[PDB]
Design a protein around this ligand. Structure first.
Ligand SMILES: O=P(O)(O)OC[C@H]1O[C@H](OP(=O)(O)OP(=O)(O)O)[C@H](O)[C@@H]1O
Ligand SMILES: O=P(O)(O)OC[C@H]1O[C@H](OP(=O)(O)OP(=O)(O)O)[C@H](O)[C@@H]1O
Ligand SMILES: Cc1ccc(N)c(C(=O)O)c1
Ligand SMILES: Cc1ccc(N)c(C(=O)O)c1
Ligand SMILES: [Mg+2]
Ligand SMILES: [Mg+2]
Ligand SMILES: [Mg+2]
Ligand SMILES: [Mg+2]
Lengths: 347, 348
């Protein structure tokens, strides 16, 4: 007999929910049946209790049930995502978006989920738009983009219209909640591999748990400097997910010869400034931003290699770094972005 | 510059707020500038972080600044309230309301803050209405009632119209929050003494701290059976507020000769049934309901005595118990209710 008083009371008592209660709540939210006060109370209470992977799995699974899917047999079995929670508070260039282009240029199919800025100056979607990429395509044209260009972009508001009540509440209250975890967990193309950034150190493990219950090869990553990306300024924590299990480890890019960078060297600006940074990297400019892009692209290539799991961790990294660099140095990435822009103009 | 993201982020980080932040939030809420989502997020976050006396003091002070006051010089310096949070989830007769009548009949001015039921079958206000008492009077008439009858009732929605945004959110989410503490702390007549029940054991101390900052003479009470009243079924915890400090006590009514009652002996029903229980007690019927009323009335009289605090605890209780018993057995309590009903009927 589920209800808001029952579910909110359990959370405010600091108890995990019974199985199915988070799903009930999320379905009320997604069908327009929850009052904004109830949505907010639920989001905050779940956040302060500390959500479990089972609970977040219910939230994401319900949200996916209401999403627009891509057409049958249009997403390759080995498609990868590169996306994070955001909310790291650091205002960087768009590392995930740049890595995604590089990964696609390396020959790995990419279906990227993304959205505009929430609290940074330019989000991945804003920057793609400033580059001339069409961010607003429906299921059929995202599938065509993927088939014709090797990359597609699923704009969250276009694919998750029923999330609008939750989204408005998120904007009204501003504070990060458990809802900030859901974007990376609800890519409507349901790719089985991903490099997934988490700004919230204590929730990365929960996100990894969600992925472990799916048929997935994922690196969930948190930079020990706070970034929702693999960082070049220090070590990162990685939760490797494969075969239904998790392997937590400390990762140090100095092992691959990367110089230690400063956070300010990765600083971004508005959409035009961040778009310029994309073009600079794809044109071969050497430096800290490139290094961070190559590191993250390699990470996504390692996640992808985990699907057809021949190679071991270290060799997979060495190959990922070689492929990511070559994709830039040979012009493939610059060429792939141009092709993606062309595709959107030819629609 | 205070803001929702700032304030809510601090609470979700499990930090106490900076001075002024809770006041800002409450002023947004009281002016209609807070979205329902913001109100709910704040109420829940403040609850799960665990509110401090300073924070609740800010909420209550802002709320009072928006309330209708009584007219100047109409509330005696020694007026008392008898009121609790409710939310104990035990169906009982209206113990605070009955005690309030008995206290007034003992010659202690009572200005009661109250409201309808939120969870229970009949709240104080509902039962008073069933007895024929006019509960919906403005400031001038509550003042007149206090003067002519010895008791007045401030009906919370009449005195706190700007709380309507918060009250709506409270109903929508159902779960108890820090807002459930505010009733007893926002009596618009500002009596300086009271017997204040708290259903939430871990928050009684916080409520006591707010009264300590006001230098009120107050007993904040929680029955160890969960009641937001002094109980007769077992011991109670009392946070005694005197001279601006709080000390915590275990109270056992057995020491005053009270037999242990069972919770079902205090069971209530709808407004008509609880009105009958009131009439039975005031007519002098013995038994567990009278015992509980007498105990709580004495507690309020003890709090009142603490305003002139040469207050040896056990003798204060002994005199309080005697005064409450006499107020019933002389007929004064039954007579006072009749006077109160008469006053309301004269208004037309
Ligand atoms: O404004 P914030 O909350 O900090 O978030 C900044 C971006 O991070 C996330 O995207 P993603 O990882 O796809 O993009 P990026 O790493 O390329 O910016 C999010 O969807 C935003 O677009
Ligand atoms: O429905 P609940 O949330 O359980 O609350 C029951 C009653 O308790 C409070 O009043 P008070 O202590 O003034 O009244 P009483 O006479 O019923 O004790 C509250 O305003 C309700 O009238
Ligand atoms: C950020 C986000 C994601 C999905 C949505 N439906 C919306 C929305 O409707 O505003 C917003
Ligand atoms: C408890 C309480 C206090 C003031 C109100 N206006 C309301 C209300 O509008 O329902 C409720
Ligand atoms: Mg990112
Ligand atoms: Mg980032
Ligand atoms: Mg009461
Ligand atoms: Mg009670």
């Amino acid at each position: 007999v589920p209800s808001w008083p029952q579910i909110l009371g359990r959370l405010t008592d600091n108890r995990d929910l019974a199985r199915g209660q988070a799903a009930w709540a999320m379905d009320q939210i997604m069908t327009g049946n929850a009052r904004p006060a109830q949505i907010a109370a639920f989001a905050v209470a779940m956040t302060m209790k500390a959500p479990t992977a089972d609970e977040v799995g219910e939230l994401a699974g319900v949200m996916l049930s209401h999403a627009h899917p891509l057409p049958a047999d249009t997403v390759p079995d080995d498609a990868v995502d590169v996306v994070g929670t955001g909310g790291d508070g650091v205002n960087t260039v768009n590392l995930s978006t740049m890595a995604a282009i590089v990964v696609a240029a390396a020959g790995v199919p990419v279906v990227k989920h993304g959205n505009r800025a929430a609290s940074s100056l330019s989000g991945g979607a804003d920057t793609l738009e400033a580059l001339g990429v069409r961010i607003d395509l429906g299921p059929d044209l995202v599938a065509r983009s993927l088939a014709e260009v090797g990359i597609g972009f699923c704009f969250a508001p276009r694919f998750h219209p029923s999330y609008r009540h939750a989204a408005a509440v998120r904007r009204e209250i501003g504070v990060p909640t458990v809802f900030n975890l859901l974007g990376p967990l609800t890519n409507p193309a349901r790719p089985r591999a991903g490099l997934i950034g988490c700004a919230f150190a204590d929730l990365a493990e929960v996100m990894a748990g969600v992925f472990a219950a799916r048929r997935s090869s994922v690196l969930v990553v948190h930079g020990d400097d706070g970034l929702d990306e693999l960082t070049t300024t220090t070590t990162s924590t990685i939760w490797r997910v494969a075969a239904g299990s998790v392997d937590k480890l400390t990762f140090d890019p100095a092992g691959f010869g990367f110089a230690r960078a400063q956070l300010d060297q990765l600083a971004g600006g508005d959409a035009q400034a961040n778009a310029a940074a994309v073009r600079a990297v794809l044109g071969g400019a050497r430096g800290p931003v490139r290094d961070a892009v190559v590191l993250n692209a390699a990470g996504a290539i390692v996640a992808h290699a985990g699907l057809s799991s021949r190679a071991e961790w270290l060799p997979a990294w060495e190959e990922g770094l070689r492929r990511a660099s070559a994709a830039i140095d040979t012009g493939a990435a610059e060429q792939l972005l141009a092709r993606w822009v062309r595709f959107g103009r030819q629609i």
